[PDB]
Motif scaffolding. Structure first.
Motif, PDB file in Angstrom:
ATOM      1  N   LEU A   1       0.827  -1.195   0.000  1.00 43.43           N
ATOM      2  CA  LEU A   1       0.000   0.000   0.000  1.00 43.43           C
ATOM      3  C   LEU A   1       0.879   1.270   0.000  1.00 43.43           C
ATOM      4  O   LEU A   1       0.723   2.140  -0.866  1.00 43.43           O
ATOM      5  N   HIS A   2       1.813   1.354   0.949  1.00 46.05           N
ATOM      6  CA  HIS A   2       2.706   2.518   1.055  1.00 46.05           C
ATOM      7  C   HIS A   2       3.339   2.906  -0.274  1.00 46.05           C
ATOM      8  O   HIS A   2       3.262   4.060  -0.698  1.00 46.05           O
ATOM      9  N   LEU A   3       3.953   1.933  -0.931  1.00 44.79           N
ATOM     10  CA  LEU A   3       4.718   2.213  -2.130  1.00 44.79           C
ATOM     11  C   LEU A   3       3.826   2.661  -3.266  1.00 44.79           C
ATOM     12  O   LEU A   3       4.217   3.510  -4.064  1.00 44.79           O
ATOM     13  N   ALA A   4       2.629   2.086  -3.350  1.00 41.76           N
ATOM     14  CA  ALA A   4       1.722   2.440  -4.432  1.00 41.76           C
ATOM     15  C   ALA A   4       1.285   3.859  -4.184  1.00 41.76           C
ATOM     16  O   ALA A   4       1.208   4.675  -5.105  1.00 41.76           O
ATOM     17  N   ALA A   5       1.021   4.149  -2.916  1.00 42.24           N
ATOM     18  CA  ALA A   5       0.651   5.490  -2.509  1.00 42.24           C
ATOM     19  C   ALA A   5       1.717   6.509  -2.937  1.00 42.24           C
ATOM     20  O   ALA A   5       1.412   7.485  -3.623  1.00 42.24           O
ATOM     21  N   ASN A   6       2.968   6.268  -2.560  1.00 41.70           N
ATOM     22  CA  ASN A   6       4.032   7.214  -2.873  1.00 41.70           C
ATOM     23  C   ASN A   6       4.158   7.512  -4.360  1.00 41.70           C
ATOM     24  O   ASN A   6       4.342   8.670  -4.753  1.00 41.70           O
ATOM     25  N   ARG A   7       4.056   6.478  -5.190  1.00 41.41           N
ATOM     26  CA  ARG A   7       4.224   6.687  -6.622  1.00 41.41           C
ATOM     27  C   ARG A   7       2.881   7.004  -7.267  1.00 41.41           C
ATOM     28  O   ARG A   7       2.794   7.195  -8.480  1.00 41.41           O
ATOM     29  N   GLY A   8       1.838   7.052  -6.443  1.00 40.05           N
ATOM     30  CA  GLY A   8       0.537   7.532  -6.876  1.00 40.05           C
ATOM     31  C   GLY A   8      -0.237   6.660  -7.852  1.00 40.05           C
ATOM     32  O   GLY A   8      -1.089   7.152  -8.597  1.00 40.05           O
TER      33      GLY A   8
ATOM     34  N   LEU B   1      -3.019   4.879  -8.240  1.00 37.72           N
ATOM     35  CA  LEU B   1      -4.265   4.808  -7.479  1.00 37.72           C
ATOM     36  C   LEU B   1      -5.040   3.542  -7.744  1.00 37.72           C
ATOM     37  O   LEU B   1      -5.601   2.956  -6.822  1.00 37.72           O
ATOM     38  N   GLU B   2      -5.084   3.136  -9.007  1.00 40.12           N
ATOM     39  CA  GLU B   2      -5.724   1.884  -9.384  1.00 40.12           C
ATOM     40  C   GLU B   2      -5.200   0.717  -8.545  1.00 40.12           C
ATOM     41  O   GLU B   2      -5.986  -0.074  -8.013  1.00 40.12           O
ATOM     42  N   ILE B   3      -3.874   0.636  -8.416  1.00 41.69           N
ATOM     43  CA  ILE B   3      -3.213  -0.336  -7.545  1.00 41.69           C
ATOM     44  C   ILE B   3      -3.652  -0.165  -6.096  1.00 41.69           C
ATOM     45  O   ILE B   3      -3.751  -1.137  -5.354  1.00 41.69           O
ATOM     46  N   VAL B   4      -3.903   1.074  -5.690  1.00 38.01           N
ATOM     47  CA  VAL B   4      -4.289   1.338  -4.309  1.00 38.01           C
ATOM     48  C   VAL B   4      -5.672   0.773  -4.020  1.00 38.01           C
ATOM     49  O   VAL B   4      -5.888   0.098  -3.008  1.00 38.01           O
ATOM     50  N   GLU B   5      -6.603   1.055  -4.924  1.00 34.89           N
ATOM     51  CA  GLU B   5      -7.965   0.578  -4.785  1.00 34.89           C
ATOM     52  C   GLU B   5      -7.966  -0.938  -4.686  1.00 34.89           C
ATOM     53  O   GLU B   5      -8.565  -1.508  -3.770  1.00 34.89           O
ATOM     54  N   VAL B   6      -7.269  -1.574  -5.626  1.00 33.97           N
ATOM     55  CA  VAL B   6      -7.147  -3.026  -5.658  1.00 33.97           C
ATOM     56  C   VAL B   6      -6.610  -3.561  -4.342  1.00 33.97           C
ATOM     57  O   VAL B   6      -7.127  -4.544  -3.809  1.00 33.97           O
ATOM     58  N   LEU B   7      -5.567  -2.918  -3.822  1.00 32.24           N
ATOM     59  CA  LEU B   7      -4.986  -3.341  -2.558  1.00 32.24           C
ATOM     60  C   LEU B   7      -5.973  -3.056  -1.458  1.00 32.24           C
ATOM     61  O   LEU B   7      -6.080  -3.805  -0.490  1.00 32.24           O
ATOM     62  N   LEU B   8      -6.693  -1.956  -1.603  1.00 32.49           N
ATOM     63  CA  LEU B   8      -7.688  -1.632  -0.611  1.00 32.49           C
ATOM     64  C   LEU B   8      -8.757  -2.700  -0.673  1.00 32.49           C
ATOM     65  O   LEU B   8      -9.109  -3.277   0.355  1.00 32.49           O
TER      66      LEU B   8
END
Lengths: 144, 96, 48, 156, 96, 96, 48, 96, 96, 152
Positions: free
Chosen positions: D107-114, D116-123
């Motif tokens: 989550l952290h790393l996806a967040a930093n590089r922005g 978001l699609e990856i973030v949602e998926v991880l979420l």
């Protein structure tokens, strides 16, 4: 950068000029120190002089003056150049859409076209009609 | 990038809040300087003015420039286009 | 880097019984189909 | 750690889909690690080779395998923005809340590089949004500092 | 020909009382109204310059000089007006 | 020693008060569109006289008295080296 | 002078693509050269 | 331009200069590449220069359409420009 | 000393390459920047160029670019030599 | 219409007369608020100063920073002008935005004859500038011994 004609003269131009001696076939010397922050010393040689060597000598004396110049002036990099004064040609660059602003184009020309024209044998001097980009930090005194 | 400059940390406050460069200045990409501005036929331009090295050949040199330039054209962004507003050379050629 | 820009040097020879200007012409041809923004130059002996 | 193990390492990081298949037929190691503890899964994830990742995962590769610095392939995928590879790993058992030695989650790393699609998926796969690194920062924190308005919305 | 010039006199005594560094004065005055080249950065794989300076709107008017603060050694911010003075005069822009 | 100062302090003072500053300008590019005034900003210049160097303020004590450079040194025009003297027919001279 | 029949090639980043993209264009040009062993032989990267 | 004029002032002239070549001498002038920010002599903010290429010698028949006539006519007209010095002139055989 | 290939390229190699202008009879210029801290930049001139002249031109430009390089690099210096892969002999000196 | 500002500055005496006769404002002001009187005072054209004063030039005209043409002549040692301006009305106790009297200016630049002329017209010697310095303070710190004693 940000210096006036007098500050440029009395901090660079004069210091340089005073280290110009024992330079063969030298007919005269002239310089302008101005309010943009710019010096332009032109040493003109007897017709027939090897320009390559006139450059080597002038620059030799200049290396003596260099570390007496101020850090900022050194850090802009001083040039020494063996060109004619007149323009051989102006290579103009436009964008026939309007997908690029004037600033944008200049940055293109500078980071993508200039250096190589600059390195072309025969090319005394290249003047960029505009400015390459720079990371501009524009400060606010209230917030500061 | 601009984003990365804005992120630089000027100081951490008494309370713990952060003061960033973006919090005291407008980070932006823009000229080294802003003194030179060109137009070509009224239209926004840039370009380079070229002075012939001492003793060097006018015509021969011009050629070398057109050759170097031509290597650049294929890689231009859309719309970018070289124009030839001032040139001392073609008179020489034409007149000889 | 080569003439100012980032680069990658590539070596090779013409195959058995082919000329270099042939092998070169193919490299030149093959290179045209590379991604946009990628260019190529001939250095060294090939320059000459 | 073997003739084929290393060979496989080479093949995965370059993504020679076919050579992988063969080595897979030949029983090459799926736990072959280099000096930094990267297995061919890591290599395929860092470099974005979807077919290989899928292939390796079928052949019993460790999906929660971890470098000498604590980082699992999911990290490398999330950080370097390969949506499809992230989904696969996750669907195939990946730990979504894995913390490298610095306490940094994927989550952290996806967040930093922005990404978001990856973030949602991880979420969506239930990433702890409140989890924090050694410095004590959340992925929301990463977002506000970087000044991603869109991303910070999601992370609320 | 010569032109109006804005001359600021930094009072060495007043500065020295408040605890403000002359280095601090001159850099502050100078970066803001003149520009300073801090270092380089990389912009799409080419080395270019970073510049610090004042936003146009805070270096336009003679009244703006007093809006710039420098920090004295005791931590207090001190307006440029506490330690300077001004007059118009004529200098050259191009000394030959 | 009477003023609790060293050559070091003398040097610092001379560096700070015999300065020539790039100060910037009013209405410099890039300007706020509609600016009317363009003038150079002059700050400190190089000292020009033996007296100007005399005035250089080294420090000010608690009681308000001011220690100048002339209170710790004699101050005159004299050569960079005193190593070389010439006479011409035994009469004082210089030469090339 | 190295090799006759031999060539020396420079792949060039003419638009700010960077290392990863250039390694990739290289990979492509190499792979697409390996598929002509009748003209191109021993076509290789010079660097690490 | 006079002492302490701005980009804006200069540009306004440049515009009038560019305008003249584009409207009045359209039958003779191909391009006008104009720069704000320098001019052979000076280099400031009140300074400008314009490079002008003509249509080919063929479409310019007679004395009236050759450079000497054009530049005299341009200069003459340009004199009516309020508050500036605007010169159009031919570059000579040997620049030296 | 202690730099990675990128650090070397981005603080040293680019800055130098960027300053290699105005040199005569260049054909091409190549450079490698590596993990050991070292850069080499090879400028290759036309056949029949005086190598002494070419070498001095190259070094005169390097000289000028020098203040643009990091401390620890100007400190180490940057050597400029002729390329000749011709040894007369190699004397080995060993301890048995 | 401010060909007058220019001609003042330039020191062309007829050109000032003729544009004075054609109506042009005696108090025309350039970007920094200098009047043709400011200009003539700074450049030291005594002849122009008289003419401008005949035609009712504001003798205490202030510039964007608040200095008067008197302030200039004092600082620049144009004695005749200092007189002429003082006669014709000039506030000899004038202050620019930094609290600076023409006395301060003439004092600092060691123009002693002018110090006296200002003094005669009643110049406050205890006038402090924005830093609290008097003309005496200046002379003592400039180390000018003549001037110092003249101020008592």
């Amino acid at each position: 950068p940000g210096a006036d004609a007098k500050t440029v003269q009395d901090t660079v131009t004069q210091v340089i000029e005073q280290n110009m001696n024992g330079i063969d076939n030298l007919m005269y010397m002239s310089s302008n120190s101005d309010s943009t922050g710019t010096v332009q010393i032109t040493l003109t040689f007897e017709s027939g002089t090897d320009a390559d060597i006139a450059q080597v000598q002038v620059q030799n004396k200049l290396q003596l003056a260099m570390p007496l110049l101020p850090q900022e002036v050194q850090q802009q990099g001083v040039s020494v150049e063996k060109s004619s004064s007149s323009f051989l040609m102006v290579v103009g660059v436009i964008n026939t859409d309007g997908t690029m602003t004037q600033e944008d184009i200049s940055d293109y020309v500078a980071a993508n076209m200039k250096d190589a024209i600059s390195r072309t044998s025969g090319v005394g001097d290249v003047q960029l009609f505009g400015s390459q980009y720079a990371m501009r930090i524009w400060m606010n005194p209230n917030e500061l | 990038s601009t984003e990365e400059f804005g992120k630089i940390l000027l100081k951490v406050n008494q309370d713990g809040s952060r003061v960033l460069l973006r919090d005291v200045a407008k980070i932006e990409l823009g000229g080294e300087n802003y003194d030179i501005i060109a137009e070509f036929n009224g239209q926004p331009a840039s370009g380079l003015g070229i002075k012939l090295a001492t003793g060097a050949n006018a015509l021969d040199t011009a050629a070398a420039i057109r050759a170097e330039l031509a290597k650049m054209e294929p890689f231009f962004p859309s719309g970018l286009k070289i124009v030839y507003p001032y040139d001392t050379t073609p008179f020489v050629k034409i007149s000889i | 880097r080569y003439n100012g820009l980032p680069s990658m040097e590539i070596l090779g020879q013409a195959a058995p019984g082919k000329s270099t200007g042939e092998a070169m012409e193919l490299m030149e041809q093959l290179a045209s189909k590379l991604p946009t923004g990628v260019g190529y130059d001939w250095t060294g002996m090939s320059y000459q | 750690g073997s003739d084929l193990g290393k060979k496989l390492l080479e093949a995965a990081r370059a993504g020679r889909d076919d050579e992988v298949r063969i080595l897979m037929a030949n029983g090459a190691d799926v736990n072959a690690a280099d000096v930094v503890g990267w297995t061919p899964l890591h290599l395929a994830a860092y470099w974005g080779h979807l077919e290989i990742v899928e292939v390796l995962l079928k052949n019993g590769a460790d999906v929660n395998a971890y470098d000498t610095l604590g980082s699992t392939p999911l990290h490398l995928a999330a950080h370097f923005g390969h949506l499809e590879i992230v989904e696969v790993l996750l669907k195939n058992g990946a730990d979504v809340n894995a913390k490298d030695d610095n306490g940094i989650t994927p989550l952290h790393l996806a967040a930093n590089r922005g990404h978001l699609e990856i973030v949602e998926v991880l979420l969506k796969y239930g990433a702890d949004v409140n989890a924090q690194d050694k410095f004590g920062k959340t992925a929301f924190d990463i977002s506000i500092n970087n000044g991603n308005e869109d991303l910070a919305e999601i992370l609320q | 020909e010569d032109t109006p010039q804005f001359k600021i006199d930094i009072d060495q005594e007043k500065a020295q009382a408040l605890g403000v560094s002359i280095n601090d004065i001159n850099t502050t005055l100078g970066a803001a109204w003149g520009g300073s080249y801090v270092n380089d950065f990389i912009d799409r794989g080419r080395v270019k310059k970073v510049y610090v300076m004042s936003e146009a709107k805070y270096r336009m008017l003679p009244d703006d000089i007093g809006d710039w603060y420098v920090r004295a050694a005791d931590g207090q911010m001190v307006p440029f007006s506490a330690f300077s003075s001004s007059r118009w005069e004529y200098g050259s822009p191009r000394l030959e | 020693n009477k003023f609790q100062l060293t050559p070091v302090d003398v040097i610092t003072a001379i560096k700070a008060q015999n300065a020539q500053v790039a100060a910037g300008q009013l209405g410099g590019t890039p300007p706020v569109k509609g600016q009317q005034l363009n003038a150079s900003i002059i700050a400190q210049t190089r000292l020009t006289s033996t007296e100007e160097f005399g005035k250089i303020l080294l420090k000010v004590n608690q009681d308000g008295s001011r220690v100048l450079l002339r209170d710790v040194a004699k101050i005159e025009l004299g050569g960079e080296n005193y190593d070389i003297i010439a006479e011409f027919n035994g009469q004082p001279a210089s030469g090339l | 002078l190295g090799t006759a029949t031999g060539f020396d090639f420079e792949l060039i980043d003419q638009a700010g693509l960077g290392h990863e993209k250039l390694t990739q264009a290289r990979n492509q040009l190499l792979a697409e050269a390996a598929k002509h062993p009748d003209m191109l032989t021993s076509v290789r990267p010079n660097g690490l | 331009l006079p002492a302490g004029a701005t980009q804006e002032r200069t540009q306004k002239v440049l515009n009038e200069v560019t305008h003249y070549y584009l409207t009045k001498e359209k039958n003779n002038v191909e391009s006008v590449f104009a720069v704000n920010g320098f001019n052979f002599a000076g280099r400031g903010q009140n300074t400008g220069i314009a490079f002008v290429s003509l249509k080919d010698w063929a479409d310019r028949p007679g004395e009236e359409n050759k450079v000497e006539a054009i530049t005299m006519r341009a200069t003459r007209a340009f004199s009516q420009i309020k508050d500036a010095m605007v010169f159009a002139f031919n570059l000579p055989a040997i620049v030296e």
